[PDB]
Design brief:
This is part of a larger assembly, with 4 copies of chain A. Chain A starts with 9 loop residues before the first helix and ends with a helix. The first copy, chain A, has one domain: Up-down Bundle (Ferritin), CATH 1.20.1260.10. By secondary structure, chain A is mostly helical. Chain A is elongated. Chain A has helices at about 10-35, 45-70, 90-120, 125-155, 160-165. Chains in contact: A-B, A-C, B-C, B-D, C-D. The interface between B and C is medium-sized, with 31 and 31 residues. Bound molecules: fe (iii) ion (4 copies). One fe (iii) ion binds near residues 58, 61 and 106 of chain B.
Amino acid sequence: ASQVRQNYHEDCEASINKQINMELYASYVYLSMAYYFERDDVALPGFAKFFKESSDEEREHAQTFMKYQNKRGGRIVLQQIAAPSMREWGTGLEALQAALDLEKQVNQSLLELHSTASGNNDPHLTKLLEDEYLEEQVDSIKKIGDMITKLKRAGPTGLGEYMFDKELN
Amino acid sequence: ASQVRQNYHEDCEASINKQINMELYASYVYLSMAYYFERDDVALPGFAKFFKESSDEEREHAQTFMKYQNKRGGRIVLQQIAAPSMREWGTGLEALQAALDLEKQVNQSLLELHSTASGNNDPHLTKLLEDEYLEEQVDSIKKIGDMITKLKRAGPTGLGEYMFDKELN
Amino acid sequence: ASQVRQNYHEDCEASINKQINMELYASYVYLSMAYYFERDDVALPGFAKFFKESSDEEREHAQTFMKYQNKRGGRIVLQQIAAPSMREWGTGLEALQAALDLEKQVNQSLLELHSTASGNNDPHLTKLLEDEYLEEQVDSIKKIGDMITKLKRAGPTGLGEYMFDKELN
Amino acid sequence: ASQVRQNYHEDCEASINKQINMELYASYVYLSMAYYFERDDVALPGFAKFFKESSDEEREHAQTFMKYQNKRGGRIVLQQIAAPSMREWGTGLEALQAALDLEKQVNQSLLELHSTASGNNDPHLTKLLEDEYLEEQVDSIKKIGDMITKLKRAGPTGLGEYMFDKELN
Ligand SMILES: [Fe+3]
Ligand SMILES: [Fe+3]
Ligand SMILES: [Fe+3]
Ligand SMILES: [Fe+3]
C-alpha cells in the first residue's frame, strides 16, 4: 500500500480504473465523430468542432480520474480502448442521439460509482463526483437535448441542418 | 396614518391596488412562458429571453405603482397572485397571441384607470398613467404585433421559427 | 416529453415545484415589507433596501429551481402565490423577527427536500441543495440574527433605530 | 394683444400672475428659514442648506412661470411680496411642518390652476402644470413627510436633531 492512502477502499480504486477506460472510450468515439463530419461528402464543420471539443473534454475527464487515483494512493491500470462502435456516423441528428445516449451511459456509470463511494463512506470521493462529474454530465445531457430539439425544428437535414451547423460554429 | 395625502380619492387608491395585482399576475404569466421555452423539448431561447424580460418589466410596473401609492399617501394592499391559466403555452405563435391578448387586457385596465383618474380630477394620476404606462403599453402591443406578423411570414413553425427565434436572441 | 430525464424521481420533482411556490411567496412577503418601510409615516429606507434585495434574492432562488427542474427533465407546475400574512409589518424589530421566522421555515423546507433527495439517492439534487440553498440560508439566518441583536442594543426604537437604519443603507 | 398669443384666455393669464407672486412668497419664507438656522443660538446647518435650496427652487419656479407668461403672449404683473409669516421659526420639526403645509397650499393653488386650464381647454397649460409643477410638489411633499417621520424617530430635539441635521448636510 501507499504512504498517502487513507480511507480509500479497493472497490473504489477498481471502479476509478474502469471509469478511466470508459472516459477514454468516449473521448475516442467523439474523436471518430469529429473527423467524420470533416469528410468532403459530409462537410459539417460545426458538428465537427463540437465533437472535437467533446473528445478533448472526455479525455480531460479521464486524466482527472487518473490524477485522483494517484492523489488517494490507488494505482492506475490502463486497459485496451475499444474501437468506436461505428466507423460512419450517419446524419447530424443521428450523431447527436448517439452522444446523448453515450453521455447517459457515462452518467449511469458515474451514479453507480457515487453509490459505491457512499456505501464505503468515502466523503472525499462522493464530493469529487458530485462537483466534477455529475454536474458536468447533467449539463452535457441537457445541452445535447436542447440541440436535438433545435435541430429537429430546423429540419434535421437539408437547408435546416446547413443553418444549424453554422450556429454551432 | 399618512401626512402627504392631498386630492387622493379612495376609488383611485383602490384601482391602483387592483392594478398592482394585475401587473404581478402578468409578471407571473411571462415568467411561466419564460421557462416553458427552456424545456429540453421546446428549446426556443429567443422566445425565452423575450418573455423573461417581459416578466421583469411587468414586475417593475407593479413596483412603480407601489411606489406611487406611497408617494400619494394611499396604502398598498397586496392580494394573492393567481396561477397562470396554463402550464404549457403551446407553440411560439400561440404564446405570442396569448401575450398580445394579455397586453390588451392590461391596456384596457389602464385605460379604465385613466378614466377613473379624470373622473376624480386627479391630473397627477392621469399624467402618471399617460407618461409611465399607456405609452409603454401601446408600444409593447405594436411590437408583439410586428413579431406575430414576422413569425407567420417566416413560417410559424419549422425552420422559419428556428430562424425567427435567433433574431429574438 | 423530456429526453434528459435520468435518475429523477417524481416526489423530488414534486418537492421542487412546491419549493418554487414557497420561494415566490417569501419573495412577495419581502416585497410587501420593502414598500411598507417607504410609507411616509414609517420612513425607514435602510430597512426598505434590505427587504427589496431580499425580495430579489428569493425570486432568484425560485428562478434557479425552475431552471433546475428543466435541467433534470421535470416539469414546472406554478401554483398561486398566497397574499402575505400582513399589510403592516409593525416596527423594524417586528419585521426582522418575522423574516428570521420565515427564513427558518424555508430552511426547514429545504432540509426536508435535502432529505427526500438522499432518500431517493439523487446525489445531484443533494449537491444542488447543499451548494446553492442550505449554504445561503444558514448565512442569511446568521445575518438577520446579528441584525436583531444590534437593533435591540441600539434601542429597538427611537434614535437607535434611526441610526441602525442608516447603517443598513 | 400679442402676435404670439393663441388659445390663451385672460383667466389663465391672471392666475399665472397670482401664482408668480405665490412662488416668490414661498421663496421668501424659505430664505427666511435658511438664515434662521444660521443664527449662533440655533446652529442647524443642515436645515439651513435645505431651506436655502428650497428658496432657490421656489424662486426658480416663479421665473419659469414668468417665462411661460411671456411665451404665450400674456403680460407679467408683479405684486408686493409679503413678509414671511414668522420672523423666528422655532424648532427643526416645527419648521418642517411649516414647509409641508406651505408646499400643500401651493399644491392646492396649482391644482386649482390646472382646473382653470382644463375648463378653458388649454392643453398646453395643463401639460406645463402636470410636467413642471404638480410632479414637483408631490415629490416635495413626500420628501418633507419622510423627513418629519425620520426626525420624530431620532427625537425631534436634543441629540437626535443634532444627528438628523448632519445627515441633511
Ligand atoms: Fe465524461
Ligand atoms: Fe404593464
Ligand atoms: Fe430562499
Ligand atoms: Fe413651487
